[PDB]
Ligand binder design. Structure first.
Ligand code: CHL
Ligand code: CLA
Ligand code: CLA
Ligand code: CLA
Ligand code: CLA
Ligand code: CLA
Ligand code: CLA
Ligand code: CLA
Ligand SMILES: CC1=C(/C=C/C(C)=C/C=C/C(C)=C/C=C/C=C(C)/C=C/C=C(C)/C=C/C2=C(C)CCCC2(C)C)C(C)(C)CCC1
Ligand SMILES: CC1=C(/C=C/C(C)=C/C=C/C(C)=C\C=C\C=C(C)/C=C/C=C(C)/C=C/C2=C(C)CCCC2(C)C)C(C)(C)CCC1
Ligand SMILES: CC1=C(C/C=C(\C)CCC[C@H](C)CCC[C@H](C)CCCC(C)C)C(=O)c2ccccc2C1=O
Lengths: 187, 47, 35, 222, 734, 105
């Protein structure tokens, strides 16, 4: 009925399966409080949305051909300096986060501004929720992979994909972990 | 008999007197040093 | 960052004179308070 | 303490019932847990704001007509000696503030001279004094900004506006010598509503009032 | 009555006396005696207090960082780690005078500063900190850490977030996590920081956060770690002629076992420390999967305690029933923790001076002396606390029906034998040590010093010969090439360890004579006697022949009155308060020995200590009197040198010692009658009887008398010895 | 030197074989008097969130699809032991080929 870890059956009693994308993945038994588990569900959904925006921003910035690398753009030069960016970044996004937390405490779902549903077009299918949760887990895995491309290979994500496609045997984890000084010294 | 009666009228209450003495002590302590000292040749800011 | 040159000329007087005075006043009100 | 608060979604304090006008519930330390103390503080805020309106409009007029810088204007040679000017200022204020305090004790208004309140035309309404409190608070925040921009930038209000309009991206409060301190301060100010909401949600019961030596709110704690 | 200050004690609230304040302060954190409270609330208060104590620790070290970065000479000390003294913090005293300001301007400062003896300069130079901005950002980071620890203390005490009572009682999971995470991966992160930053900074390469993730720690680059060729890391170590600040004589080695010390700075190698912490990390992580967590594997502590019962009734019931005894009693765990931490602190003191881990620390004599003295005094105080809290465990939470016939019931059964044998060994040690010291003093007084009894410490000398010291002769291990211990690892650490141990300049296994043996035996006397007092208090805590019902009277009660001959100082608290005196004497002895031996080593006159530590007049004259000349000359009618503050705090310590005597000799009744007469005087006078006291003045309690006398005694002891130590080590050395 | 893959794989395969075919009969009999039902067994009732967090999850003991009782927790433990032994052998060989003799001559 559920994907679980693998086709082998590992049914947990705490997670029946009513949650969107509930495969019962609780090996360490993290969710048992029955009050902060809903908070963890909201945390997973919000982290998945943020991971969605992160991976789509990285993919779009590499596809459109920005000059700076994806994790090297923090020290890049802009019309607005970094000192003129942190104030509004804290202020307006803190206002948004406070309103979202108040809406979550009032109703139990997310929300941008004031209104809980934030559905101008609707499409609030349970299948849509399951797809959102699974696509968010995939985006989380993708962002971890992107950070690992930046760490080990020190290259762009789609650049690493092209390197793996061109030379599958010679541009893998074994080569990139057995040739760290070459990677440090400009690949 | 008019004097020394309304002089303490705005300071008779406990909150007003406590606020006045705290404000005056803090102001005198902050004035000490950068303004209280270095004018009466106090041997701590000379070197 | 680096504090100004008058910072030792200012901060030591509070914590030496008016911070113990405020703390002692608050504690003296705390001891003798009745219900 | 009114539906409109200092940050959206805030809860009013227990002692701030919204009876007093101009309330926005911005009482993090609760220094006004007394009716007499808050009416005296309201009068004090009104004074430090009314003189702020006067100072702001005077400084704006001096900058408009070409008069020199305000914080350096005290060293110029003026008619009447400064010592006797100070003693006649003290002499006139020892009557003005005395009459103000006696009138506040007998009426409570911010009257002047012998007419308490000094309202000859009769424009008195709660909305007028609400706007007076708002404009006074804005004017005294503007005076703090004037003093800040006259210390690290060395320019007046009009010159500060001209420098903001010349290049707003790199000429602001976050790019000066206090720029990093301003960034840390505004990050703290943005992080306050994320702390206080967390404690309010966590503190479903009890009191959770802040304990400070000035107020007697810790009396009910123990 | 019913005042609000003792909110944790209704009985103390209805106390119309000044004692209500005192007992309102001393019983502040004794939550077990607070009225109307449960075990879960006590555990939550313990958690919040632990978070606060941690936040205070982080605030104190952040303040040390800030006060070194601001008004300090850390960069100047980095450039010259020998000549210019470190600066602790600036002095702004308006009571100072012009000669005081001029005399305290040291280290190239713009004002009066304090010369740092804490050793943070050497430590931060060793770990890689070089600039003041790094110390600034470290201070603000640790302030933020203290802020989030305050957040944790507030949040974990809040409702719906307070941990359950059984959550703290999860001993297996706590042990596993604090072995794997608190110890293992923390040491792994520390050795990673060492390898990434400190070794390149010791090799003249700046590794900061800006240039992080772009500088390779090793030229091979992590492929030896995967391939298992870990010897590539120990390939090119730093040479003997290597400068710590620069890259001259450098090498490429992140992990090695180059024993001994760095020749340029007389300190342990950075790669050696990194390898040590890495090995400690992997060993702790491996050991941290022992205990039974929620998974199907592990060890149960109760089952191990049940199983380890010796057959044939050697230990009776064995270690059975001890799991609930440890878990239920917080004082048992408190005593075990304080004892282990005191032993570790004593180990730190005994190993830091002989093996300096920080660069340019051995040359700083005052710093090493202050660090050793501080660590030994802290260790002694918390061993006394360990035994005191063990007595508290024996009085408060000990059920003989639970652990019946086990090791605890057996040591309670033959407690008289243990106390008697400890008294015997203490009497033997003290009698003969004083007999030998008095014999040597009388012999030296008669002008013929060769009659004195000098027993050569052949045991410890043979031990040191077995570890590499060839000056004593012998043919033991690590001294003859034919020994298997020498042949094993002869190219691993012996070429450095023997070089470090055969040099007499450093403090690594110093030459010991008969005076060293005599003072070590005196130290053994001090340890045995303090142990005898503490275990007499702990074993007789819940009962005795004079007081069978001592458990019903609590841990801290004054006496039982003059009946049955007299019963003063019968509680275990009073035994602890006497053992504090004995511990102070013992640590005074060990610090006197360390200070005199190291002072004679630094001056080069080791023969003076060899021929002068034999008799106590040499201790009084050549150590207490000879080295106090510069201390007492800090201020005088002639003038003032830089040691005026040390003379002032020396007299301060003597005065607080005297006030401890004031509170210790007289007990209560004279002060109660004097306060009664003062009450009559205040009540029966005009112009002053209008103002009246809200709380009746009373004499301090006998338990409070002992506490205040002990506090003044210990404060005076610590301040006096710190003054003398720092003044003598800094007036003639730099 | 010894190549890392052959040594690591042989060590972990041997350790897993010892875990499944050798030490498994000695397993579940050392835990019989350790976490058995006759003794105290479980340590927590599982009332609130922390108490049921102390309670074992439903993942380590649900079933044993292996013919023996070799669960994946034992697989992880024995594989960790095998990796430890293989890295120990590789480390000893690495010290050996570097020209350093740690053994007593
Ligand atoms: C959202 C998370 C986030 C993450 C994962 C990072 C983390 C990182 N950034 Mg970016 N940044 C992030 C957002 C932000 N950074 C910056 C702006 C910067 C700066 C100032 C710099 C980077 C750079 C770095 C590195 C930090 C220094 C180092 O050695 O690593 C630990 C690292 C790759 C550095 C870089 O690009 O190196 C070339 C760099 O100089 N970060 C800001 C300010 C608006 C951020 C706040 O949201
Ligand atoms: C330096 C001062 C000093 C000295 C020498 C002693 C000596 C002693 N104390 Mg005391 N003690 C002191 C200060 C001192 N105390 C202080 C200030 C405190 C804090 C209040 C304590 C707290 C304390 C406790 C809590 C305990 C002791 C105990 C002991 C004994 C330890 C056993 C020992 O070392 O062998 C004895 C060594 C000695 C040096 C004793 C002196 C005997 C010499 C050799 C003279 C002998 C007589 C000589 C032949 C001359 C004869 C003629 C003459 C009598 C006129 C011993 C009797 C313990 C005890 O009773 O032991 C079982 C014990 O439980 N003491
Ligand atoms: C997680 C969200 C996220 C974040 C933090 C960033 C952050 C950044 N992007 Mg990116 N971006 C995102 C999502 C995101 N982007 C998405 C979803 C897209 C569409 C696919 C883009 C498309 C994009 C382009 C095309 C460019 C950036 C650039 C930038 C930089 C400045 C953009 C900015 O505020 O200009 C001010 C924007 C205002 C609206 C004012 C900064 C490094 C610019 C850059 O310099 O990259 C190195 C740039 O050229 N981004
Ligand atoms: C220096 C004059 C002054 C005085 C006496 C007060 C005092 C007060 N004001 Mg005010 N206020 C000040 C400056 C001052 N504030 C500034 C600088 C601003 C702009 C940042 C404001 C903006 C403001 C708003 C928007 C509101 C208050 C409110 C309050 C009350 C709660 C805050 C408090 O106890 O702080 C004590 C502070 C001082 C003693 C200083 C209190 C009676 C609230 C109110 O009316 O509640 C009754 C309210 O809604 N004030
Ligand atoms: C509501 C009052 C107010 C107003 C209208 C302004 C507006 C202005 N100030 Mg200002 N300022 C304010 C409050 C205010 N500030 C406060 C509370 C402080 C801290 C005490 C400062 C400190 C400050 C400095 C140090 C400087 C300015 C400058 C400026 C100009 C650049 C824009 C900027 O930095 O945003 C202001 C930031 C806000 C958060 C508002 C602009 C004309 C700069 C200037 O002269 O123009 C380039 C300049 O040098 N201000
Ligand atoms: C891990 C550390 C640790 C912990 C958690 C505890 C916890 C506890 N101990 Mg233990 N203890 C410790 C270390 C520790 N202690 C050490 C190191 C010692 C040896 C000194 C003791 C000796 C000891 C005794 C003898 C007793 C306790 C007691 C207590 C309880 C009361 C504490 C309280 O709330 O009152 C708060 C207590 C105070 C505020 C008093 C502190 C006063 C200090 C001495 C003043 C500081 C000295 C000086 C004046 C500072 C200024 C210096 C000057 C130069 C300016 C509590 C269970 C008591 C107990 O369980 O009751 C039966 C008890 O009788 N402990
Ligand atoms: C792996 C996860 C993990 C980690 C990292 C921690 C970490 C911590 N927990 Mg624990 N804890 C955990 C899981 C974990 N917990 C679990 C699962 C439970 C429930 C079963 C608990 C239950 C629990 C309780 C009930 C308490 C803690 C506490 C603590 C703190 C211990 C004091 C401290 O900071 O160490 C400092 C000590 C060290 C880092 C090492 C010890 C020192 C030795 C001698 C080595 C010295 C190293 C070296 C020589 C010196 C270096 C410094 C020098 C150079 C200056 C610490 C923050 C306590 C707390 O609240 O904070 C105090 C506490 O009371 N924990
Ligand atoms: C009026 C006399 C007098 C008195 C009562 C004191 C009182 C004090 N002085 Mg001061 N002193 C004085 C005059 C006095 N002083 C004068 C005139 C000088 C010269 C300027 C000094 C120089 C001086 C120094 C240099 C030191 C003191 C210390 C002390 C404290 C003693 C601590 C203690 O109990 O140690 C208990 C006793 C000991 C620990 C040992 C006693 C000394 C012996 C001879 C050393 C040899 C011990 C050795 C291990 C072998 C003995 C073992 C045994 C078994 C035989 C106390 C505050 C010390 C201090 O502050 O605390 C440590 C300290 O270091 N004084
Ligand atoms: C009263 C009481 C208590 C307490 C107690 C205590 C406090 C104790 C302590 C104790 C201690 C404090 C102990 C110690 C110990 C130690 C030891 C046991 C050691 C050992 C060592 C060794 C074994 C070594 C070895 C070696 C090496 C390794 C190297 C070199 C060589 C040799 C061989 C030498 C309690 C709480 C429990 C409770 C009950 C009662
Ligand atoms: C699927 C399946 C199967 C198979 C299986 C296998 C074949 C396995 C293997 C396995 C192996 C073959 C291995 C494992 C492992 C595990 C683990 C879990 C590991 C771990 C490790 C570790 C932990 C490490 C560590 C370390 C580090 C990190 C570094 C340093 C060193 C050391 C070593 C310490 C069969 C058919 C039977 C049945 C059905 C299902
Ligand atoms: C002189 C003397 C007195 C008199 C001391 C009195 C009356 C106690 C008050 C002393 C002064 C007033 C304390 C001043 C404040 C202290 C610094 C401690 C309180 C503040 C801290 C807790 C912060 C005793 O009562 C006494 C009792 C038992 C044994 C010996 C003696 C004793 O020797």
């Amino acid at each position: 009925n559920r994907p679980l870890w693998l086709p082998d059956v590992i049914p947990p009693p705490h997670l029946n399966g009513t949650l969107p994308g509930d495969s019962g993945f609780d090996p360490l038994g993290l969710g048992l409080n029955e009050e902060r588990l809903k908070w963890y569900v909201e945390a997973e959904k919000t982290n998945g949305r943020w991971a969605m925006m992160a991976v789509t921003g990285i993919l779009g910035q590499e596809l459109l051909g920005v000059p700076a690398k994806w994790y090297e753009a923090g020290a890049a030069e802009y019309d607005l300096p970094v000192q003129a960016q942190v104030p509004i970044l804290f202020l307006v996004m803190g206002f948004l986060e406070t309103k979202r937390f108040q809406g979550f405490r009032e109703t139990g779902t997310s929300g941008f501004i004031n209104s809980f549903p934030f559905d101008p077009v609707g499409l609030n299918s349970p299948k849509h929720a399951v797809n959102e949760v699974k696509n968010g887990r995939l985006a989380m895995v993708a962002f971890i992979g992107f950070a690992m491309q930046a760490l080990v290979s020190r290259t762009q994500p789609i650049e690493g994909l092209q390197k793996h496609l061109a030379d599958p045997f010679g541009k893998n984890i074994t080569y990139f972990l057995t040739h760290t000084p070459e990677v440090i010294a400009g690949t | 008999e008019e004097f020394f009666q309304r002089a303490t009228d705005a300071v008779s209450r406990r909150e007003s007197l406590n606020g006045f003495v705290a404000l005056s002590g803090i102001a005198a302590i902050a004035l000490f040093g950068l303004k209280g000292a270095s004018t009466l040749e106090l041997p701590i800011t000379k070197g | 960052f680096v504090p100004p040159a008058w910072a030792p000329s200012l901060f030591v007087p509070l914590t030496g004179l008016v911070l113990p005075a405020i703390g002692m006043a608050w504690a003296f009100t705390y001891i003798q308070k009745e219900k | 303490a009114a539906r409109e608060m200092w940050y959206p979604g805030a809860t009013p304090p227990a002692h701030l019932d919204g009876s007093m006008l101009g309330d926005y519930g911005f009482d993090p330390l609760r220094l006004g847990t007394n009716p007499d103390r808050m009416k005296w503080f309201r009068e004090a805020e009104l004074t430090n704001g009314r003189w702020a309106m006067a100072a702001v409009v005077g400084i704006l007029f001096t900058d408009l007509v070409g008069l020199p810088k305000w914080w350096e204007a005290g060293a110029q040679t003026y008619p009447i000696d400064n010592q006797t000017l100070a003693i006649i200022e003290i002499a006139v204020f020892a009557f003005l503030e005395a009459k103000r305090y006696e009138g506040y004790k007998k009426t409570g208004g911010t009257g002047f001279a012998f007419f308490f309140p000094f309202d000859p035309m009769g424009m008195r309404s709660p909305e007028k004094e609400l706007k007076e409190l708002k404009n006074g608070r804005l004017a005294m925040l503007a005076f703090l900004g004037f003093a800040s921009t006259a210390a690290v930038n060395g320019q007046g209000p009009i010159e500060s506006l001209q420098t903001h309009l010349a290049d707003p991206a790199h000429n602001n409060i976050f790019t000066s010598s206090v720029g990093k301190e301003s960034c840390v301060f505004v990050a703290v100010l943005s992080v306050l509503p994320i702390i206080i909401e967390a404690t309010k949600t966590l503190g479903k019961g009890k009191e959770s009032v802040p304990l400070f030596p000035w107020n007697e709110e810790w009396e009910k704690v123990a | 009555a019913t005042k609000l200050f003792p909110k944790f004690s209704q009985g103390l609230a209805q106390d119309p006396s000044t004692r209500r304040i005192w007992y309102g302060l001393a019983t502040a954190h004794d939550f077990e005696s607070h009225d109307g409270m449960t075990e879960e609330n006590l555990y939550q208060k313990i958690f919040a207090s632990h978070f606060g104590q941690l936040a205070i620790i982080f605030l104190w070290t952040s303040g040390n960082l800030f006060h070194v970065a601001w008004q300090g000479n850390f960069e100047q000390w980095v450039t010259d780690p020998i000549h210019v003294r470190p600066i602790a913090h600036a002095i702004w005293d308006p009571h100072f005078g012009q000669p005081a300001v001029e005399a305290f301007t040291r280290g190239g400062a713009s004002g009066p500063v304090n010369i740092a003896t804490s050793g943070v300069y050497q430590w931060w130079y060793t770990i890689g900190l070089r600039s003041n901005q790094e110390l600034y950002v470290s201070s603000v980071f640790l302030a933020l850490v203290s802020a989030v620890f305050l957040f944790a203390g507030w949040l974990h005490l809040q409702p719906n977030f307070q941990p359950s009572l059984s959550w703290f009682k999860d001993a297996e999971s706590r042990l596993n996590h604090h072995l794997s995470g608190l110890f293992g991966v923390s040491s792994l992160a520390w050795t990673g920081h060492l390898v990434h930053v400190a070794i390149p900074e010791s090799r003249g390469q700046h590794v900061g956060w800006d240039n992080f993730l772009s500088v390779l720690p090793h030229p091979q680059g992590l492929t030896p770690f995967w391939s298992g060729n870990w010897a590539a890391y120990a390939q090119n170590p730093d040479t003997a002629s290597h400068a710590f600040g620069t890259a001259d004589g450098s090498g490429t080695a992140i992990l090695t076992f180059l024993g001994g010390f760095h020749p340029q700075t007389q300190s342990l190698w950075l790669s050696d420390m990194a390898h040590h912490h890495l090995a400690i990390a992997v060993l702790f992580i491996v050991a941290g999967h022992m205990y039974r967590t929620n998974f199907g594997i592990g060890h149960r502590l109760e089952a191990i305690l049940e199983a380890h019962t010796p057959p044939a009734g050697g230990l009776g019931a064995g270690h059975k029933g001890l799991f609930h005894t440890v878990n239920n009693s917080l004082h048992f765990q408190l005593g075990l923790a304080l004892a282990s931490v005191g032993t570790i602190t004593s180990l730190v003191a005994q190993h830091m001076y002989s093996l300096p881990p920080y660069a340019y620390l051995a040359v700083d004599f005052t710093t090493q002396a202050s660090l050793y003295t501080h660590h030994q005094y802290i260790a002694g105080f918390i061993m006394c606390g360990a035994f005191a809290h063990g007595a508290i465990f024996f009085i408060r939470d000990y059920d003989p029906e639970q652990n019946k016939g086990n090791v605890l019931a057996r040591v309670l059964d033959h407690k008289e034998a243990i106390i008697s044998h400890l008294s015997w060994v203490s009497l033997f040690l003290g009698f003969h040590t004083l007999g030998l010291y008095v014999h040597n003093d009388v012999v030296q007084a008669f002008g013929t010093p060769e009659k004195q009894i000098l027993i050569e410490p052949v045991f410890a000398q043979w031990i040191q010969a077995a570890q590499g010291k060839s000056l004593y002769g012998f043919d033991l291990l690590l001294a003859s090439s034919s020994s298997s211990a020498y042949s094993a690892g002869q190219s691993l650490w012996l070429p450095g360890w023997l070089e470090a141990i055969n040099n007499n300049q450093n403090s690594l296994f110093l030459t010991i004579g008969p005076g060293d043996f005599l003072v070590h035996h005196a130290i053994a006397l001090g340890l045995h006697t303090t142990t005898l007092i503490l275990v007499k208090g702990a074993l007789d805590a819940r009962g005795s022949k004079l007081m069978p019902d001592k458990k019903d009277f609590g841990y801290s009660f004054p006496c039982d009155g003059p009946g049955r001959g007299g019963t003063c100082d019968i509680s275990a608290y009073d035994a602890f308060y006497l053992a504090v005196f004995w511990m102070l004497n013992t640590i005074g002895w060990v610090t006197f020995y360390w200070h005199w031996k190291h002072l004679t080593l630094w001056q080069g006159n080791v023969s003076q200590f060899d021929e002068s530590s034999t008799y106590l007049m040499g201790w009084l004259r050549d150590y207490l009197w000879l080295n106090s000349s510069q201390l007492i000359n800090g201020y005088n009618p002639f003038g003032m040198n830089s040691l005026s503050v040390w003379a002032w705090t020396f007299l301060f310590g003597h005065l607080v010692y005297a006030t401890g005597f004031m509170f210790l000799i007289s007990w209560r009744g004279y002060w109660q009658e004097l306060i009664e007469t003062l009450v009559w005087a205040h009540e029966k006078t005009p112009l002053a009887n209008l103002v009246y006291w809200k709380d009746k003045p009373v004499a301090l309690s006998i338990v409070q008398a002992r506490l205040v006398g002990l506090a003044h005694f210990s404060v005076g002891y610590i301040f006096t010895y710190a003054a003398f130590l720092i003044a003598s080590t800094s007036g003639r050395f730099g | 030197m010894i190549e890392a893959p052959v040594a690591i794989g042989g060590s972990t395969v041997a350790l897993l074989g010892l875990g499944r075919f050798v030490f498994l009969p000695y397993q579940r009999r050392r835990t019989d008097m350790e976490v058995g039902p006759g003794k105290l067994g479980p340590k927590t009732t599982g009332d609130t969130f922390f108490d049921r967090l102390q309670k074992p999850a439903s993942f380590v003991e649900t079933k044993s699809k292996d013919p023996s009782g070799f669960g994946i927790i034992d697989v992880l433990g024995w594989g960790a032991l095998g990796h430890v032994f293989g890295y120990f052998l590789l480390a000893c060989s690495s010290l050996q080929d570097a020209g350093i003799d740690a053994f007593p001559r």
